[PDB]
Design a protein around this ligand. Structure first.
Ligand SMILES: C[C@H](CCC(=O)O)[C@H]1CC[C@H]2[C@@H]3[C@H](O)C[C@@H]4C[C@H](O)CC[C@]4(C)[C@H]3C[C@H](O)[C@]12C
Ligand SMILES: C[C@H](CCC(=O)O)[C@H]1CC[C@H]2[C@@H]3[C@H](O)C[C@@H]4C[C@H](O)CC[C@]4(C)[C@H]3C[C@H](O)[C@]12C
Lengths: 202, 202
């Protein structure tokens, strides 16, 4: 199929771009480096492919796609679980994802574009909001028969993700702070989930 | 006094460096730009002054100094306040600080050094840990007659700061997301403080 061939060609460009970002560095690599090693599989493929910035985000697209399904799965298959159980389910999958060297390596690439005048990053977030994981949590919240939970559902989703993620991913990215091993991951999830549901007065 | 003169000279270099970072851009400005406009007030002042990186952190030093005292004040003068009251006191001062364009402008400078091979940033955090604000919260926690609060005091301090700060400062920095106006600041503090103390089951 001509369509399959196109997709295959696209997966080729991105795989090259990725290997360069990883091998040579994001800042070091120009589009042309990408076109050269993509050989006759480019010519001009240009839709998210006009710049190395677009390619990175086309790649990040895929990664976030795979992140969602994967978190949705540990979630989808739970037996009428309590809030606690779906909360710690999501948590484990979420936190494991952000303690992979890949989370950090892409993290660094994003942080480095802080002075991008082209603003590819703003567009990406502005136009990929539906594909973020917290929409899963936000979804379970509105299901709950709690007016507080239902009216604050989005803010709560973001708040819980942050609690699990936050000082830590940021320190990983900026100064290469060590990742959490699964034991630590589990610990922190229980910890956060408890404060979150029950608060510290107890 | 010769010492006063030295300090004055130092405040001159940093004030120049700051104006350049703000006016010309951090990445755009080299040490020499700083030395030229500092005129005869440099020659080689070199202790945190050997690089533009050192100057930035010498400046950040001062800013974090002023941030601490200021937060300590809204805190220090409270009448045997409940955890709630010192929590919302700290919160307001903390969150107001991070919704100033200055927080964001320095935020951008830090994020941009993600590929700094000299690692000035790691040293700065590694060697300025005592001067961070959460040490204030960590301090009130250990005072509380709660074994949970006292044994987790540090993790709780960091956790509360994060809840107030986190998706938001990060989005401010990377994509220039809008700041919170004081009304929104207050709202978010009450919100966070409540989940934090009482959890969402209620
Ligand atoms: C918290 C909120 C979205 C909640 C979430 O993590 O799903 C904000 C905070 C930082 C933003 C994130 C990052 O700066 C970019 C990240 C890329 C990751 O692989 C997933 C999305 C990603 C993490 C972004 C999604 C979303 O805009 C983030 C995560
Ligand atoms: C949360 C924890 C420290 C808690 C705190 O904010 O006081 C971590 C997260 C991000 C780190 C911070 C930033 O990347 C650098 C920030 C500079 C700010 O003006 C104050 C400290 C500052 C904010 C850093 C202090 C500390 O290492 C931070 C804040």
């Amino acid at each position: 199929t001509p369509s399959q061939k196109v997709l295959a060609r696209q997966e080729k460009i991105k795989a090259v771009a990725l290997e360069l970002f990883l091998t040579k560095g994001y800042q070091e690599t120009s589009l042309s480096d990408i076109i050269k090693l993509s050989g006759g599989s480019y010519s001009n493929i240009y839709d998210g492919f006009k710049s190395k910035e677009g390619l990175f985000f086309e790649i990040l697209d895929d990664i976030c796609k795979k992140h969602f399904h994967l978190i949705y799965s540990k979630t989808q298959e739970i037996k009428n679980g309590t809030l606690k159980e779906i909360l710690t389910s999501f948590g484990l999958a979420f936190i494991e994802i952000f303690n992979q060297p890949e989370a950090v390596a892409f993290g660094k690439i994003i942080y480095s574009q802080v002075y991008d005048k082209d603003r590819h990053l703003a567009n990406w977030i502005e136009n990929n909001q539906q594909n973020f994981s917290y929409n899963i949590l936000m979804g379970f919240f509105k299901q709950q028969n709690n007016s507080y939970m239902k009216k604050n559902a989005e803010k709560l989703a973001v708040l819980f993700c942050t609690m699990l993620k936050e000082p830590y991913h940021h320190l990983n990215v900026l100064i290469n702070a060590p990742l959490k091993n699964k034991k630590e991951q589990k610990e922190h999830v229980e910890f956060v989930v408890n404060v979150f549901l029950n608060g510290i007065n107890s």
